[PDB]
Amino acid sequence: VLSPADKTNVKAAWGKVGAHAGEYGAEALERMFLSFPTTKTYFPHFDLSHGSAQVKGHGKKVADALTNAVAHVDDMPNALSALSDLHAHKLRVDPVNFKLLSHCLLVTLAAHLPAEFTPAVHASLDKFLASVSTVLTSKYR
């Protein structure tokens, strides 16, 4: 469960991220594709070339979904309902990959937030991303 302290940590951290969110989303995807090449099996239809505009576009979509999740951290299952439907019924990414992307988002945030990425915020961010992942896989079966 996201504690009141978690929610404040997440809101503050993502607030600092601001309009860099889309960029950081794309960076996290690139880190994921390089570090965990099996995740590319979900994007055979993508252009995965360096600096791919298609990957950048997708990074913005992922980031915008996270921004919305932060804004509705008290009620994420409802806020992410349509997206959860799409993941369960169409995308059907195996649940193990959400941990890989979450890790790469954490690494991205760490690399861009030298001051804000405290151990406590690190912990809260990890819980938040795990919670989002849980919602997105909640309707799988």
Residue 72 assigned ligand-binding role: no
Which one, of 4, 6, 14, 32, lies nearest residue 123 by Cα? 6
Structure tokens at 81: 């309902």
From ligand HNI, a copy of itself, another protein, none, interface partner of 49 (C-beta below 5 to 8 A by class)? none
From ligand HNI, a copy of itself, another protein, none, interface partner of 55 (C-beta below 5 to 8 A by class)? none
Residue 32 or 76: the one with the smaller Cβ distance to another protein is 32
Q: Note whether 5 binds a copy of itself by CB under 8 A.
A: no
Q: How far is the CB of 118 from another protein (least distance, A)?
A: 7
CA dist 23 and 72 (Å) reads: 21
Q: How far is the CB of 121 from ligand HNI (least distance, A)?
A: 17
Q: Note whether 90 binds a copy of itself by CB under 8 A.
A: no
Using CA atoms of 83, 3, 119, 106 in order, give the dihedral in degrees to the nearest 10: 0
CA dist 77 and 65 (Å) reads: 12
Residues annotated in the binding site for heme b, as ranges?
Answer: 87
